[PDB]
Every structure is written in structure tokens, then in C-alpha cells.
Design a protein around this nucleic acid. Structure first.
Ligand SMILES: [Mg+2]
Ligand SMILES: [Zn+2]
Ligand SMILES: [Zn+2]
Lengths: 48, 1183, 319
DNA sequence: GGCCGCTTGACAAAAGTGTTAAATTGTGCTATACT
DNA sequence: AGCACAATTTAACACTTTTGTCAAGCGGCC
């Protein structure tokens, strides 16, 4: 569940990445960052 | 000078620029790319901007300064804020704002005329029409009505919250009217409620300045605090603080608005960009309604804004009052061991080197040891293990100097006390056993806050009153405490349980036959009668009252007298039969105090045992001793109290509790009755429900029988062998605890509520059927969650008790009051219309040393009025009560005295402790809390009734009662089984449902009307249709029932002095010169407005009734109140008006820093006492 | 449920603009400061005084007209022209609002709440709509759509839970952030500090790169979560008690000194008050000159030290 | 004649003024896309 | 996502000068 909740932001972040820019930098690796689904997933074992 | 009273209330916006002056503005940056501190904006050191090279001019002298760059001799390096206050200004100048205005319609709605929408305009979302130019739609107005577009329909005009400031003088000039034309609204009912609240709010502005500056136009926070530097340690880093960031959303907003407004900014854009500014105000004040988390839009922790932290709940108000931080103490474990019984303590021999280091250093300075005080600070740090000479000088410091030992948690006055530190070995801090009974806790690694008083004026103020050898003997409540606790009782009980081992019943011609023959076989030293006595003829202990019975203790030491009370004739003062065992007891207490003359006429002999009566011996001894000697007893009963059990031993073997050999077949008959009620089902008889409770009662009775059989089997044969009874009788055991082990206890009830079918095959010796424990656990669950749940609500209720009774202190001398209270000597029993002896346990502690309202005549001498009827007079009245001379012993209770600010002199008969009248300074207001500060843990919150009556909250079912005393009138129908009461007048309709619908007749004042079996209708109706007659007494009687159910030692006026507080407030009706027809004036203070003015104006009143929590929100002061659950409305009402805090109040002094008005700092004890004879002789002529 | 809705209902209640009423009302601004410029150089009002003060009157919804009425034989049209063009600051600037809000939903996180972002955002219109090149045949539309975000980026950098982050830090933080997330998505593990140097270019090593993530970006602690962290060491009680003590000890340790030595040390080692006068200033008032007054200084270091090795007192240094 | 003390000269070390080099803001403004 | 120009402003560092300290020389006193 927590993982999902964290993955939720990623989808929201991708949307913002699709609303702006087109040729510059839009590849399935740039639209996805290892910060939301990570930091929010790590703070669960350290504080919960 | 000297601190005294205190002032507060609002402060005009001009006054805000007074304390703060200036120095503010700029962003709230807490640092820069470099130079972490300075920022020249947020917490900038007043006139400190890198190198201002000025400001130091304001300062007259003291020292140099002006160092150009870096910093001069300013505060930044030293004296920076010095923890002192430093207001800013926050500038501000926008439309308007709001000081929260609380949530009780203050500063608005009350002074105005709008509710549930007064914020619509105060938040810039409406329009408070405040102009007259003749409208069109539906005539003009003078309040909110233009909800957008409306105000533009005609296009003065105010759509923002700025109108709040405009209604200042507009309401000031009309203020005089708001107090006249407003009060002009006579009765008419209904609306006569608002006119009261509206007048109370306008009554403040009616005098003592105070303008409607509620419409803040410039806030002023604080900067000195919030700023925590780097904090490494352990495994972490970085740091900061609040009050700054949450504040950034205020200044910046004000500036940005100054940038938008200055430039082109259309209405719409400003209306929303402004409402956020006031939102920031409430944000800095209290975060509620919506909240403001961090890292938006993500939700996390709520920003701390005064709420719950600082000026609010536990954060800077609950921790500063009492739970502060002692800078002279320590903690440790607990231990027990024969020290000396009081007068001494344990305390480590290492840490004590720090607690008593100060004076210890000065001692060495002159004792050669240390050359100077400084050097003495560098000889005991690196743990060089001194253990040389220093341990000696330490004794001189710890000589007659007591220490305060505390216990956590704390409960009642018996939660601190003081002893004399006697450094032992190791580190474990030990204490006297008895003292444990005062803290309620088993030695299992618990700690005790060891506080240490410095000032010598605190040492004498301690060891003379807090010494365990004084304020512990006879505590509050009602019964003693210093009495020999557990263990000790069994050390003297093991020698007085008869020696009758059953030998038969022979006979001798004066000891010449069955004296030598029986000495061979059969018939030892038990029964058998001869001439008159019995087998007592064997070892005649001669001696005399010269040097104790020689032959007695002498024969016991050898292989003769088996001791343990084997029946023997002594000589003491007369030819008795007492065994050498009891003789020891009388001999221990003899040499202890002085001569057995006292113990002889005190200690019983007919029914010795030393059972639960050791509390009566020491108690009765106080009357002929007085600490000095009393203490000696608890010391004599100590040494022997433990040695006797040591050089004897009594183990609890698995067999020690021999199983009832005469029990097995009992369960057979009980089980043989099982089929009896079972076969009734197959025959179709007795409903399944009837069968249920039918079998329950069966085992509910047999259990008592089995317990009786056991207790019996353990009474006759097997005397000292069974220890399970040695403690059950009177030592450290429970009776119902026996029926559990050797018994079979299994009448457990389901988790929800339904006694199981088959009980439990207890008999521990035989493992349960794996089901019995799982079934018995269901009930063994509530017996743990309830006690632990005594910190959820019940624990947060005792505070309410301490708050109410606070300024109650015994002072003055003889007030003179007529009306008196007559305590009932006999109470009724709802079950049967017949009074009982009240069990005596209630009358005793209820009249223990009181003040006879009037002369008491009852067979023989009379009990003069105002006589301190001690325990003696009590028994004299109780035993004479059965005769038929007294029914209501006259007495004076704290409930009868025209003094709300102070208790009363000689009225609070006896100071229930030192066995004498109360002393001027005894803050009974706090002692009253110490009384109720104990049963709390011993209750059942899982339902709660004691607090029900306090807050005067309407009980369950309301328990409808007859408001008037009419006549019978008992009509019945179908579903309207209601009962009425009337007489030649009006008849009320009591829709009595379907429950306790008894008959009764001949009217009834209040009683209960029949349905109200218990917990009569909320006192609100009582006092409403009766007065302060039943209210003040009904509590003292009912509230105690919850305590009597558990047999509480406390009682007397301890609970009768807290009621006067809830019933010391009166209302107003046709006052004299005094404003407010409604009002809520207090008792005494109101009596003054009718005492001095009586020499002229009628000022009638009505005895109002307030709860326990209500007696805090509205009091004569403000420092109190709050706490509970309303630390928002208090400071509000408290402010605005003058509401000047009183002066006589424990807290007022503790908080402000003043001295205690009670204790040795009372107004009755502030004279001189220094005069070494020649001093008075010299001054005699020197004058 | 936030107060943003109240404004969201007031911003989305008034219609925007058709299409031709965007330039027809814009030209009023051009000729506005123009017709206003007539009186500008006429009396010397910088043309900014006649506009700022007049616009304040244009919004009667909340003076200079005096001389603006004496209009000579050559003045009477400019009056109406000045008021006719005054309508330029009337309707316009009331539309963009709505067209705005639907943009701040992007920077919902970095810094400042949605409500706050509105300010710096819509405010960007005040200066945007103004500098509008009515010349080009592009027609105003999705233009201020940018003059807002640029104001936002120029705001999120100005306002934040930091201290002072210019355009040379936010741009670098996010650059070191995207890079840290760029190499991360192309490595498998979190890149260190020095391993990011190559990712940048010149000047960026490991120290300065660490100094960027050292200051802040939004941390600065969660203020005071869960009186949060104790720590303290400024107005130390013992330090103050020992302060006067160490001072008194000296007042006593100077009892075995002479005026022509103690006072010398007093004024020399700045003690009397704070003046750290030197032998030069101590020699003028003390009759004798330098040397011997300096041979007494040393005499103090010795005659005093000789009273330390035999008398414990070297425990005042650690303070 | 010798020793001690005081004063002056020389040497060394650390400031006020000057000089220049590095950073922020505004604004400009850029710029691109959509209506 | 941001670069420049300019402009202007902020920050610091270094110089030549001055001040302070130490050693040497001269004078006075014993
Ligand atoms: Mg424990
Ligand atoms: Zn300065
Ligand atoms: Zn009284």
C-alpha cells in the first residue's frame, strides 16, 4: 500500500512532465525520478 | 519595591509601538550565503547591520564600544536579549486583521449584532453596510447585507474587515447607550439572555480605558528565542526552530501587498491577497479550522503556533507552573533494610559528593584539605577515586541536614516527606519499609526523585514539618499510616494464635495425678481442668515488676518454654495466664517508651492476636506520647518485628495450603443438581432463561460454603501451619484470595456480560483443562484495563479538584457564624424503610474532632458547644446512640462561614494529623485534594459517578423527581404509566416511562418521585426547587457512597470544604447601584456590596449552582483557570476588562515569584523572634 | 475547502475578453501616457506623476484635476482624451486572472502554497499586460501565461524556507538535483558528491558542490516537530558564577602585587574596563618610560607565576 | 669604579585608506505556444 | 530555463604607514 501511495506521485509527476516540453527531454527514465517512490518509501521503515 | 498585584487586558495599537518602538521590517531570512547569524532583517540584533557604527549612543555609560566592523561592545557578544523580552513591530498597515477573537463570539457578535456569519465580512468575503443614504430594494440598513454585487448595485461602503476599526468610536459614543438602551430591554423572556452577555462585554469598555483595538493593524512577535544552533552528539546534525518560518507568512505578505497596492491592483486581486494576511495572524496565534502543514500539498506535522505549545496546553504553562526543572537533585533505585526507622535515610556515598559539594568545599578550606575553593573543584572530577578524608568532612555537612525524597507518581500529602541522608555503600538508595504504604508501590526497581533544599531557612522549614517522623504518623484521610505495615504484623501475629493442640480433658487432685502421668503420654499442656485453672501449673514464672519476668524469658531461651504462646503463669503485676510470647510484646513497648504502665492498660489480652488492631494501639498511644515517644514504638516494633520472623521462618510450601479433604463430595452434590435442572428441559419446564440464572445462584452460594469449610479447616486444626490464613486474618492476605487457590472459583462472566455455564476447575495444584484459563481470562482482562485506564480520564480529573479549592487557607480567629449543620447519626436504607447504625465506620471519621454546634446533652456530662469532640467523645456518642438520646450531633462544617477567600478559624475542627486543632497556615484547600488524591487508582472508570455530580451533569435517565410536594396521584393506563403530584393547585405531568414505578403516597418534597432510585435529578433542579440546603449535604452523603463501597479512610470535612466553592456564587436581581441585573457576583464579595451599602439599598440574590469545571473558567482571578480544556476563552474574557488578579493565592505567589501566603509565610506568621535576652535589655534603653 | 476557493469563485465569475476588445482597449494605454505626457513636459511632472496620481483617481472605488481644468485656448480636447484613455486602467487586467490560476497548479510543492503562488503569479500580469507590443499581429493571449511562471521561478527562489537563494543557486540546486537523478537513473545507486563533478564541468569539484547542498533548499529542519531539540551553551549559569569567581580570585591574587605593577598590568592587558592600552600609554601617565615598566610586566609574569606553582590555580584556563 | 635604573633608538608587526574584483536585481527581455 | 548588460552594488584584500615592543646606551647613584 505504502509503495503504491508513493508510486502515486510518480504518475502525477509524469503528467506534469507531459504537459510541458516535447523534444527536449521526454524519455521513460527522465519523466521518472527515484526520489518520490524512494524517499517516501524509506521514511516508512525509519519512521512509522 | 516589591511585587504585588498584576494588570493585563488589551493594549491600543499606539501602546504596541511603545514597547517595541521600532527595529523591524525586512524579510525573515535566518541567515546568508555567509555569516550564518546576522541577516539584517529577521532576528537582526536591533541596530546591528554589519557595521552600523552607532546605536551605542543611547547607552549612557558602563563600558566602551564602537569597534567599527565586526561588532562592538554590544549585546551580540554578551547581554544579547539576555532572555529578556524584545518586541519588534512587523510594521503592517494593511486593511485590518483579527486577534483570533476566541471562539466565544468575543470582540464581535456580542458588541455587535451578527452570528454564524460575522466572519463572512471579517474575512473579506461580504460587506458590513455601515452607512445611511436610503437604499431601494428593502429600505436601508446598518449591518451586513451586501453579499457581493449588492454594494455595487448603487454604483459610505465597507466590504472588508477594515470596518471593524471603523466601528471603534462609532461604538464608543454608543457604548454608554449599549449599557443603557441595551439594558432597556427588560424581561420579556428569551432575548433577556443576550442583553446579559452583550452588557458584560460592553461593561469592560464602560471603564478603565480599553478600546476596541481588537482589529489588529500591526503584530509584534519575538526573535530572541527560536534559533537552535548545530547539535551533533550521538548520530545526528543540523538544527533550527519555529516561530520564524511560520512567521514569514506574515511580513512578506504585508510587503507584497504594499507592492501590489502601490501599483495597479484591482479589487478582486486585493480582497484575496489580504484575507490571507489576517489568516497569517490567526496562523501565528493558533492553527485551527483548517490548519497549515509543511511541504505542501503534502500532509505531515502541524506547525506549532502557541496552541498546545507555549501559552497553551502542556508546552509552556503546564511545565512552568509545577513540573519545572530542579537544579539540585537526582534519582536512583529503591531498597529496604533496618536503618533506624525514620530520622535517617540511605542516599549514595558518591553522588552525594556533588549535592553537598558547595559547603563541603568551604569546610575543607579551613580543614587544611583544600588550599582554596577553586582547587577543591579539581580534585573530584576525573574519578580519581578520592575515598580519603573527604568522606569525613562530608559527614559534618550531612549532620542534622535533612533531604527531601520524592516518589513518582505522586499521590496525596504522603508523597514526599523528608529523612536524614545516611550514606551507606554502593549506589542503591534505601528507605524505611512503612514509608512505602504512603507511596503505594512494590520494590521492583522503582526510583525516587531525591530533592535537596539549599537555603537554611528551607532546612528548618523541612525537617520540622516534612520529616517522616512527623507528617506520616497520622496522615489526612482518617486512619493512621505510620502503623506497622505488612510483614511486621506477621512477626507478632505468629505468637498469639492460641496453642490449643487438643489434648483431651483429664483431671488432677490439684496437680498430683495427671501432672506426671499425662506428662508421659496424652494430655500435654492444652485443655484439662483441675481445681479451677488447668495445665497452667507447670512452670510458674516468678520474678516481678522489678526487671521483667526472669524465669519467663529465661526458660524460653533454653529447652523449656516452647514460647510461641504455650500458656504460662507470670507475675508481672498480678497472677495472670499470658504466655511469655505476649510478655515480649509488652516488654518491647515497655522499655521502648517508658514503663509498661501505659501499654498495660492499652494493650488488650482477651482478644490479642495482634490482628488488624496495630493501627489502634499506636493511634491511642499518640494521646499519651506525641511523636518523641510515638516514633520510638515504630522503632521497637521494627527490630523485633523482623527478627522474630527471621529466627523462626515460615515457608509457603505447595502443601502449606492443605487441600480441603472435606471438599470433594461437595462438588458431587452440586453436580448431582446439574441433571436436576438439565432434565427439566427435556420435559419442557422452566424457560431456558430461568434455567440460566437458576444454576448461577447455585454455584454462587456453594462457593461461600466451600470457603467457609476451608477457612474453618484452617481455624481449628492446623493453626500456625497454614500461612494463607496468617496473612488473611490480618497481615498481608485476602480472604477471597483463598477461595481461589484451594477453592475453585470459576463463576467468571463472559467478556461482554453473561456468567459462563460451567465454572472453572481451579484447584491450581491440578492444571486447568486448557479451557478454564482461557475462560477465566475473559474476566481477568477488565481487572487490568480498568486500573490502567485510570490515567485516561480519571487521572485528568484530579486536576479539577486541586484547581477549585486553592485559596482556601485557615486564618483569622473566631469569625462568628450562627447557622450550623447537624450531621445525621443514622441513615436510611432504600431496601427497607429503617435507619441503620451507619456501620459506625461512617460516624466516627465523620465527627472525628469537630466543633459541636451547640451543647450536647446525653447521659451524664454535657458536651459543651465548640468542644473538640475527639475519638473518645465519638465513641461516647455512638455507644450512647443506641440508648436513644442523640440523633443529630450538632457541629460546625466549613460550609457555614461568610468567607470565600479564606477557610475559617477553629471551624475546621482538628488538623487530622497532629491530633490537635488546625494551625493558622494549613492550606486545607490543597489538603482537600490530598484526600481525594488516592482512591482514584482504586476505582472502576469502565462504566465515573463522582465526577458526574461535580460538573452537575444530568445523570442517566435523568432520574425524574417531584419538583414540588403535592399528593399521591397515581394513575395508570396502557403505555402511559406516568405518575403525577399535586394538591389543590397545579398538577404537573411526569411522563414516567416503564421501570421503577412504585406506589408511595402523601406527597413528597423532593425524595425521588419513585423512579429516581439512585443519583437523583441533577443538582440543578434540586437547588432550583430547594436551595443550598440539600445541595451542600446531598453531595457529602452521596459522593461518599462511592468511597464507602471500597471502605475509604478519608471523609470528614475534607470533602465538605470543596463543596462551598461550587456553591459560593450567586446571581443578581434588582441590584443596588451595582450594574448588571444578570451578573454572577461571588458570595462574600457580594455580601460586601450589601454590607457597607446597608447603612443607607436592597441587593437581593439567588444561590446559583455551578459545576466543578465551571468554578475555574470564571473566578476572582485568572492565573488559575485555563488548564482543563479551554485555555483560549479564559485569557479572552480575562483580558479586555480590567479583571485585576487578586493577591492571596498560592499559585499567584509561586508563579509571579512572590512568597507563599500559607505555610510559614502566612500573614499570621511574619513577626520577629530574635532576642538573646541582653538584646531586648539593650534595645530597651537604646530606644 | 481552503480560502483559495472564495477567490476561485470571484475569479471565475467574470468573463474574460472577446477578441477585438483586447487591442482596442490596449491602444488607450499607449495614447494614455502620451496624452498624459502633454502636461508632463509642460510643467515637468516626469509624466509619471500625472499617471500614478491620476490612476489613483481613476479607481474612485476607493486634485491634480485643478490645473487640468484651466485648460487654455489650446487645451480642452486633451482633457477628455486623458480621461478617455483613463479607461485603459479600467476594464483590462480583470480577465487574465482566471487564465492564470490554471498555471500555478504546476509549482505546487517547491515553495509557497497554492494561495501564495497566486500573488507573485497574478502580480506578474501587472507588469506584463503593461509592456505589450500591440504592433505584431499575434494578439495577446497565452503570453502572460509565461510572465507568471517566470515570476514564480523568480519568486520561489526569492521566497522559500531557506535564507537567500538568488538565480545562481536555485538553478544550480535543481541542476545538481536533476543530475543526481540523471546519473541515478543511469547507474543504479545514489552518486556521491565528487562523482558528480564530472557531471558538471569546470570549477565544480566536490567541495563547492557540497557547499550548495549544505546551505539549504527547503530543509532548515522541520522547525520544532516532536520544545523539540534542547541543546544550549550561551548564558551558562556556572560560567557566570565562576566568571565573577575567577574575577574575585584575581582581585585576591592581585593583593600580593604593587600599584607600580598591578595597575600596569591593569591598563596594559586591558582590565580596568576594556581599554587595551599599551606600554606607550602606560608610560606617559606613569612617569617612567617603556622598558622598566616592561621589566615590571615580566616581573609580574614571574613574581606571579612563582605564586602559582606553589598555589593551585591553573584550573581557570579551561573556561 | 661598578652597578642599577631610565630613556632613547631600532626593528618588527599589525592598522586606515585605497584599489579592485566579484555578485544581484531589474529589467529587459528573452521566447514559444495557444487562442 | 535562463544570459546579458548594464549597471550598479557588495565584499574583501592589500598597501604604506604607524604603532608597539625590545634591546642598547647613557646617566645617576651607591
Ligand atoms: Mg516498577
Ligand atoms: Zn560597531
Ligand atoms: Zn468560620
Amino acid at each position: 500500500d505504502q509503495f503504491r501511495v508513493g508510486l502515486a506521485r510518480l504518475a502525477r509527476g509524469v503528467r506534469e512532465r507531459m504537459v510541458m516540453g516535447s523534444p527536449d527531454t521526454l524519455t521513460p527514465a527522465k519523466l521518472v525520478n527515484s526520489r518520490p517512490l524512494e524517499a517516501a518509501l524509506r521514511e516508512f521503515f525509519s519512521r512509522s | 519595591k516589591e511585587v504585588r498585584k498584576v494588570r493585563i487586558a488589551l493594549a491600543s495599537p499606539e501602546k504596541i509601538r511603545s514597547w517595541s518602538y521600532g527595529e523591524v521590517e525586512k524579510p525573515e531570512t535566518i541567515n546568508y550565503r555567509t555569516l550564518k547569524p546576522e541577516r539584517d532583517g529577521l532576528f537582526d540584533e536591533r541596530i546591528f547591520g554589519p557595521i552600523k557604527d552607532y546605536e551605542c549612543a543611547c547607552g549612557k555609560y558602563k563600558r566602551q564600544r564602537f569597534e567599527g566592523k565586526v561588532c562592538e561592545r554590544c549585546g551580540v557578544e554578551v547581554t544579547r536579549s539576555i532572555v529578556r523580552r524584545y518586541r519588534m513591530g512587523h510594521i503592517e498597515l494593511a486593511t485590518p486583521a483579527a486577534h483570533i477573537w476566541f471562539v466565544k463570539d468575543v470582540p464581535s457578535k456580542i458588541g455587535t449584532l451578527l452570528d454564524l456569519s460575522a466572519t463572512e465580512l471579517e474575512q473579506v468575503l461580504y460587506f458590513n453596510k455601515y452607512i445611511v443614504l436610503d437604499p431601494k430594494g428593502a429600505v436601508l440598513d446598518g449591518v451586513p447585507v451586501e453579499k457581493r454585487q449588492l454594494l455595487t448595485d448603487e454604483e459610505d461602503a465597507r466590504m472588508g474587515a477594515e470596518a471593524i476599526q471603523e466601528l471603534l468610536k462609532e461604538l464608543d459614543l454608543e457604548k454608554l447607550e449599549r449599557e443603557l438602551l441595551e439594558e432597556m430591554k427588560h424581561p420579556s423572556r428569551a432575548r433577556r439572555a443576550k442583553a446579559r452577555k452583550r452588557l458584560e462585554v460592553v461593561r469592560a469598555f464602560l471603564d478603565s480605558g480599553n478600546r476596541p483595538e481588537w482589529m489588529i493593524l500591526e503584530a509584534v512577535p519575538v526573535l530572541p528565542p527560536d534559533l537552535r544552533p548545530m547539535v551533533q552528539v550521538d548520530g545526528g546534525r543540523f538544527a533550527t526552530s519555529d516561530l520564524n518560518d511560520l512567521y514569514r507568512r506574515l511580513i512578506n505578505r504585508n510587503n507584497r501587498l504594499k507592492k501590489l497596492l502601490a501599483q495597479g491592483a484591482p479589487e478582486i486581486i486585493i480582497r484575496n491577497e489580504k484575507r490571507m494576511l489576517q489568516e497569517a495572524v490567526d496562523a501565528v496565534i493558533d492553527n485551527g479550522r483548517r490548519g497549515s502543514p509543511v511541504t505542501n500539498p503534502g500532509s505531515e506535522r502541524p506547525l506549532r503556533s502557541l496552541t498546545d505549545i507555549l501559552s497553551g496546553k502542556q508546552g509552556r504553562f503546564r511545565q512552568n507552573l509545577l513540573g519545572k526543572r530542579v537544579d539540585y537533585s537526582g534519582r536512583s533505585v529503591i531498597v529496604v533494610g533496618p536503618q533506624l526507622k525514620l530520622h535517617q535515610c540511605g542516599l549514595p556515598k558518591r553522588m552525594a559528593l556533588e549535592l553537598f559539594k558547595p559547603f563541603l568545599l568551604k569546610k575543607m578550606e579551613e580543614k587544611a584539605f583544600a588550599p582554596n575553593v577553586k582547587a577543591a573543584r579539581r580534585m573530584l572530577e576525573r574519578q580519581r577515586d578520592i575515598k580519603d578524608e573527604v568522606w569525613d568532612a562530608l559527614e559534618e555537612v550531612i549532620h542534622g541536614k535533612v533531604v527531601l525524597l520524592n516518589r513518582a507518581p505522586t499521590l496525596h500529602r504522603l508523597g514526599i516527606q523528608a529523612f536524614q541522608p545516611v550514606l551507606v555503600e554502593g549506589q542503591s538508595i534505601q528507605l524505611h519499609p512503612l514509608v512505602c504504604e504512603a507511596f503505594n508501590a512494590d520494590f521492583d526497581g522503582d526510583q525516587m526523585a531525591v530533592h535537596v533544599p539549599l537555603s537554611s531557612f528551607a532546612q528548618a522549614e523541612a525537617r520540622i514539618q516534612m520529616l517522616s517522623a512527623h507528617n506520616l504518623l497520622s496522615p489526612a484521610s482518617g486512619e493512621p499510616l505510620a502503623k506497622p505495615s505488612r510483614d511486621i504484623i506477621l512477626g507478632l501475629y505468629y505468637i498469639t494464635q492460641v496453642r490449643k493442640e487438643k489434648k483431651g480433658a483429664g483431671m488432677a487432685f490439684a496437680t498430683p495425678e495427671e501432672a506426671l502421668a499425662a506428662y508421659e503420654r496424652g494430655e500435654v499442656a492444652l485443655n484439662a481442668p483441675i481445681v479451677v485453672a488447668g495445665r497452667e501449673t507447670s512452670v510458674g514464672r516468678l520474678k516481678f515488676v522489678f526487671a521483667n519476668p526472669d524465669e519467663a524469658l529465661l526458660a524460653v531461651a533454653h529447652g523449656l518454654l516452647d514460647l510461641q504462646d504455650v500458656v504460662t503463669v507470670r507475675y508481672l503485676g498480678r497472677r495472670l495466664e499470658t504466655s511469655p510470647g505476649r510478655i515480649l510484646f509488652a516488654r518491647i513497648v515497655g522499655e521502648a517508651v517508658g514503663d509498661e504502665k501505659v501499654a498495660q492498660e492499652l494493650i488488650q489480652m482477651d482478644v490479642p492476636q495482634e490482628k488488624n488492631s496495630l493501627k489502634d494501639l499506636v493511634y491511642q498511644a499518640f494521646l499519651r506520647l506525641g511523636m518523641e515517644k510515638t516514633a520510638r514504638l515504630l522503632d521497637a516494633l521494627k527490630y523485633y518485628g523482623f527478627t522474630l520472623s527471621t529466627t523462626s521462618g515460615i515457608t509457603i510450601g505447595i502443601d502449606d495450603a492443605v487441600i480441603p479433604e472435606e471438599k470433594q463430595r461437595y462438588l458431587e452434590e452440586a453436580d448431582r443438581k446439574l441433571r436436576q435442572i438439565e432434565q427439566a428441559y427435556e420435559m419442557g419446564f422452566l424457560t431456558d432463561r430461568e434455567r440460566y440464572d437458576q444454576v448461577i445462584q447455585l454455584w454462587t452460594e456453594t462457593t461461600e460454603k466451600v470457603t467457609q469449610a476451608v477457612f474453618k479447616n484452617f481455624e481449628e486444626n492446623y493453626p500456625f501451619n497454614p500461612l494463607y490464613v496468617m496473612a488473611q486474618s490480618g497481615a498481608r492476605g485476602n480472604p477471597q484470595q483463598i477461595r481461589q487457590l484451594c477453592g475453585m472459583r470459576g463463576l467468571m462472566q463472559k467478556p461482554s456480560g453473561e456468567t459462563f455455564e460451567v465454572p472453572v476447575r481451579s484447584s491450581f495444584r491440578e492444571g486447568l483443562t486448557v479451557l478454564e484459563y482461557f475462560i477465566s481470562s475473559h474476566g481477568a482482562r477488565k481487572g487490568g484495563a480498568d486500573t490502567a485506564l485510570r490515567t485516561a480520564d480519571s487521572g485528568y480529573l484530579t486536576r479539577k479538584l486541586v484547581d477549585v479549592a486553592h485559596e482556601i487557607v485557615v486564618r483569622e480567629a473566631d469569625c462568628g457564624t450562627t447557622n450550623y449543620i447537624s450531621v445525621p447519626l443514622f441513615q436510611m436504607d432504600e431496601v427497607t424503610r429503617t435507619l441503620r447504625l451507619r456501620k459506625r465506620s461512617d460516624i466516627e471519621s465523620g465527627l472525628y474532632g469537630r466543633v459541636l454546634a451547640r451543647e450536647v446533652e446525653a447521659l451524664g456530662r454535657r458536651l459543651e458547644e465548640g468542644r473538640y469532640l475527639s475519638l473518645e467523645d465519638v465513641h461516647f456518642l455512638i455507644k450512647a446512640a443506641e440508648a436513644g438520646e442523640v440523633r443529630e450531633v450538632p457541629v460546625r462544617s466549613p460550609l457555614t462561614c461568610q468567607t470565600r477567600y479564606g477557610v475559617c478559624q477553629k471551624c475546621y475542627g482538628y488538623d487530622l494529623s497532629m491530633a490537635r486543632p488546625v494551625s493558622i497556615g494549613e492550606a486545607v484547600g490543597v489538603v482537600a485534594a490530598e484526600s481525594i488524591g488516592e482512591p482514584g487508582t482504586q476505582l472502576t472508570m469502565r462504566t465515573p459517578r463522582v465526577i458526574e455530580l461535580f460538573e452537575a451533569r444530568r445523570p442517566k435517565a435523568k432520574a425524574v423527581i417531584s419538583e414540588i410536594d403535592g399528593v399521591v396521584r397515581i394513575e395508570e393506563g396502557e403505555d402511559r404509566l406516568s405518575v403525577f403530584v399535586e394538591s389543590e393547585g397545579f398538577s404537573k405531568e411526569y411522563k414516567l416511562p416503564k421501570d421503577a414505578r412504585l406506589l408511595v403516597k402523601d406527597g413528597d418534597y423532593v425524595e425521588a418521585g419513585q423512579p429516581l432510585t439512585r443519583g437523583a435529578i441533577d443538582p440543578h433542579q434540586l437547588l432550583e426547587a430547594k436551595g443550598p440546603e440539600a445541595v451542600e449535604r446531598y453531595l457529602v452523603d452521596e459522593i461518599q457512597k462511592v468511597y464507602r463501597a471500597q471502605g475509604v479512610k478519608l471523609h470528614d470535612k475534607h470533602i465538605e470544604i470543596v463543596v462551598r466553592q461550587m456553591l459560593k456564587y450567586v446571581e443578581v436581581t434588582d441590584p443596588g447601584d451595582s450594574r448588571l441585573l444578570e451578573g454572577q457576583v461571588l458570595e462574600k464579595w457580594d455580601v460586601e456590596a450589601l454590607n457597607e451599602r446597608l447603612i443607607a439599598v436592597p441587593v437581593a440574590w439567588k444561590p446559583l449552582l455551578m459545576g466543578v469545571t465551571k468554578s475555574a473558567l470564571s473566578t476572582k482571578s485568572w492565573l488559575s483557570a485555563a488548564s482543563f480544556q479551554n485555555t483560549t476563552h479564559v485569557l479572552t474574557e480575562a483580558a479586555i476588562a480590567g479583571k485585576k488578579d487578586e493577591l492571596i493565592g498560592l499559585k499567584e505567589n509561586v508563579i509571579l515569584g512572590r512568597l507563599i501566603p500559607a505555610g510559614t509565610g502566612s500573614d499570621f506568621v511574619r513577626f520577629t523572634q530574635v532576642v538573646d535576652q541582653r538584646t531586648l535589655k539593650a534595645i530597651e534603653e537604646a530606644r | 475547502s481552503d480560502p483559495v476557493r472564495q477567490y476561485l469563485h470571484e475569479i471565475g465569475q467574470v468573463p474574460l475578453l472577446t477578441l477585438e476588445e483586447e487591442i482596442d482597449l490596449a491602444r488607450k494605454v499607449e495614447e494614455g501616457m502620451e496624452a498624459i505626457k502633454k502636461l508632463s513636459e509642460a510643467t515637468g511632472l516626469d509624466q509619471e506623476l500625472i499617471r500614478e496620481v491620476v490612476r489613483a483617481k481613476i479607481l474612485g472605488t476607493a486634485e491634480v484635476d485643478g490645473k487640468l481644468k484651466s485648460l487654455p485656448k489650446e487645451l480642452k480636447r486633451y482633457l477628455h482624451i486623458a480621461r478617455e484613455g483613463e479607461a485603459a486602467r479600467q476594464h483590462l487586467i480583470e480577465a487574465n486572472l482566471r487564465l492564470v490560476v490554471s498555471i500555478a497548479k504546476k509549482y505546487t510543492g517547491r515553495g509557497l502554497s497554492f494561495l501564495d503562488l497566486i500573488q507573485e503569479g497574478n502580480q506578474g500580469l501587472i507588469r506584463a499586460v503593461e509592456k505589450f507590443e500591440y504592433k505584431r499581429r499575434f494578439k495577446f493571449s497565452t503570453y502572460a501565461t509565461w510572465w507568471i511562471r517566470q515570476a514564480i521561478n523568480r519568486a520561489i527562489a526569492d521566497q522559500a524556507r531557506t535564507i537567500r537563494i538568488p538565480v545562481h543557486m536555485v538553478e544550480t540546486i535543481n541542476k545538481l538535483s536533476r543530475t543526481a537523478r540523471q546519473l541515478q537513473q543511469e547507474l543504479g545507486r545514489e552518486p556521491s558528491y565528487e562523482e558528480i563533478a564530472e557531471a558538471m564541468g569546470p570549477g565544480w569539484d566536490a567541495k563547492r558542490v557540497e557547499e550548495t547542498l549544505k546551505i539549504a533548499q527547503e530543509p532548515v529542519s522541520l522547525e520544532t516537530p516532536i520544545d523539540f531539540i534542547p541543546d544550549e551553551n550561551l548564558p551558562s549559569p556556572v560560567e557566570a558564577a565562576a566568571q565573577s569567581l575567577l574575577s574575585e580570585e584575581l582581585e585576591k591574587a592581585l593583593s600580593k602585587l604593587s600599584e607600580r605593577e598591578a595597575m600596569v598590568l591593569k591598563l596594559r592587558k586591558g582590565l580596568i574596563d576594556g581599554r587595551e592600552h599599551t606600554l606607550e600609554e602606560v608610560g606617559a601617565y606613569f612617569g617612567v618610560t617603556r622598558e622598566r615598566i616592561r621589566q615590571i610586566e615580566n616581573k609580574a609574569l614571574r613574581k606571579l607565576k612563582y605564586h602559582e606553582s606553589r598555589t593551585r590555580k591553573l584550573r581557570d584556563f579551561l573556561e
